[PDB]
């Protein structure tokens, strides 16, 4: 079976809907599956918010060290880092790190608030040439992932293109690009997702996201030992609201599309 046939078969076995976009930067070739269809991003959107703050920091050398007050009322669930800092402060850099490496929802919300609201994250994506991305809500409501709801969605291809631009390409200044990459490489939440489908020694940066409708996502940049980087988006969503999440599906998809590389 071809790679396309393998992906179709994976989706057929899955009980849902699979979206894959792999960009092989060796030759700009792609492996696309439902790559122009919309999926709820869930916490994969945290990358865009952090990157928008990194962009601002290009022109404000004091921004990343700016203090942000954390209060009990800022806690919204799934905030493992921000809860440690209630009554104290975190810097914008520390909020970026927490949002990306621990998927901290309070950290995401502080980034969004700093920028001026979800629409400002959309405008940043647009500024990178991403015609698809939209952020509409804060956390945790950005995870409702209702089938056919356009809020807080993108397509696998748009997200792969933008992730490539962000991490390997022209979106950010060099220090800020490097900072984003450092953050993604240090992610703690992705062991069982794309990473589990790859050779164990490949270097990987990723951001996961999960939500209702069993929506289970991961976006990654992958550095093989002897080959140019790969950029991979694996999105997955299910028809029933209380479906379990399925990171095993993402690992399986990653294994299919990175075979040979």
3-state secondary structure the chain: CCHHHHHHHHHHHHCCEEEEEEEECCCCEEEEECCCCCEECHHHHHHHHHHHHHHHHHCCCCCCCCEEECCHHHCCCCCCCHHHHCCCEEEHHHHHHHHHHCCCHHHHHHHHHHHCCHHHHHHHHHHCCCCCCCCCCCCCHHHCCCCCCCCCEECHHHHHHHHHHHHHCCCCCHHHHHHHHHHHHCCCCCCCCHHHHCCCCCEEEEEEEEECCCEEEEEEEEECCCCCCEEEEEEEECCCCCCCCCHHHHHHHHHHHHCCC
Q: Domain range holding 180?
A: 1-261
Report which of 106, 105, 137, 107 is spatially closest to residue 121, judged by C-alpha positions: 137
Residue 38 near residue 153 (C-beta atoms within 8 A): yes
Lookup result for tokens 């990358």: 47
Task: Give the torsion sign (CA, 200, 210, 110, 69).
Answer: negative
Residue 84 to residue 126: CA distance in whole angstroms: 34
Residue 38 to residue 147: CA distance in whole angstroms: 10
Task: Give the torsion sign (CA, 161, 64, 204, 246).
Answer: negative
Report which of 20, 48, 52, 22 is spatially closest to residue 33, judged by C-alpha positions: 20
Q: Is 209 annotated as a binding residue?
A: yes
Q: Both ends of the chain: CA-CA distance in Å? A: 17
Residue 242 region by backbone torsions, left for phi larger than 0, else alpha for psi between -120 and 50, else beta: alpha
* Angle made by CA atoms 209, 213, 222, in degrees to the nearest 5: 30
- Phi, then psi, of 63 in degrees rounded to 5: -65, -45
Residue 234 to residue 15: CA distance in whole angstroms: 15
Look up residue 62 and give its two tokens. Answer: 């004091």
3-state helix, strand, coil in the chain (%, to 5): 45, 20, 40
- From the number of C-beta atoms within 10 Å of its C-beta (0-12, 13-18, 19+), residue 255 rates as middle
Residue 68 near residue 51 (C-beta atoms within 8 A): no
Give yes or no: 191 in active site: no
Residue 249 to residue 234: CA distance in whole angstroms: 9
Resolution (A): 0.9
Residue 152 near residue 137 (C-beta atoms within 8 A): yes
What CATH number should be reported for the domain holding residue 225?
3.40.710.10
The total number of structural domains in the chain stands at 1
Residue 160 to residue 234: CA distance in whole angstroms: 9
Going by the DSSP 8-state scheme, the letter that residue 74 receives in this structure is: G
Residue 96 near residue 102 (C-beta atoms within 8 A): no
Residue 259 to residue 206: CA distance in whole angstroms: 19
The set of residues, in sequence order, having a beta carbon less than 8 Å from that of 217 and lying 6+ positions away, is 39, 40, 41, 42, 43, 44, 208, 209, 210, 233, 234, 235, 236, 250
Residue 103 to residue 64: CA distance in whole angstroms: 19
Residue 157 to residue 22: CA distance in whole angstroms: 8
Cα 169 to the center of its chain, rounded Å: 17
Method for this entry: X-ray
Residue 142 to residue 132: CA distance in whole angstroms: 16
According to DSSP, the β-strands at 153-154 and 89-91 are unpaired
Residue 177 to residue 181: CA distance in whole angstroms: 6
Report which of 75, 237, 33 is spatially closest to residue 144, judged by C-alpha positions: 237
In the set 2, 14, 29, 43, the catalytic residue is 43
Residue 12 host element (H or E): helix 3-14
Partner residues linked to 35 by β-bridges:
none
């Amino acid at each position: 079976n071809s790679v396309q046939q393998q992906l179709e078969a994976l989706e057929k076995s899955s009980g849902g809907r699979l979206g894959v976009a792999l960009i092989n930067t060796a030759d700009n070739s792609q492996i696309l599956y439902r790559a122009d269809e919309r999926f709820a991003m869930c916490s994969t959107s945290k990358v865009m918010a952090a990157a928008a703050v990194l962009k601002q920091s290009e022109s404000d050398k004091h921004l990343l060290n700016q203090r942000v007050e954390i209060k009990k009322s800022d806690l919204v669930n799934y905030n493992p880092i921000a809860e440690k800092h209630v009554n104290g402060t975190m810097t914008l850099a520390e909020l970026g790190a927490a949002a990306l490496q621990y998927s901290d929802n309070t950290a995401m919300n502080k980034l969004i608030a700093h920028l001026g609201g979800p629409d400002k994250v959309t405008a940043f994506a647009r500024s990178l040439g991403d015609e698809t991305f939209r952020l509409d809500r804060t956390a945790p409501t950005l995870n409702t992932a209702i089938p056919g709801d356009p809020r807080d969605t993108t397509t696998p291809l748009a997200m792969a293109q933008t992730l490539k631009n962000l991490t390997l390409g022209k979106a950010l200044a060099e220090t800020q690009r490097a900072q984003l990459v450092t953050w993604l490489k240090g992610n703690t939440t992705g062991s069982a997702s794309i990473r589990a489908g790859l050779p164990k020694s490949w270097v990987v940066g990723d951001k996961t996201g999960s939500g209702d409708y069993g929506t289970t996502n991961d976006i990654a940049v992958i550095w093989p030992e002897n080959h140019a980087p790969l950029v991979l988006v694996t999105y997955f969503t299910q028809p029933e609201q209380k479906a379990e999440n399925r990171n095993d599906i993402l690992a399986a998809a990653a294994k299919i599309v990175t075979h040979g590389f």
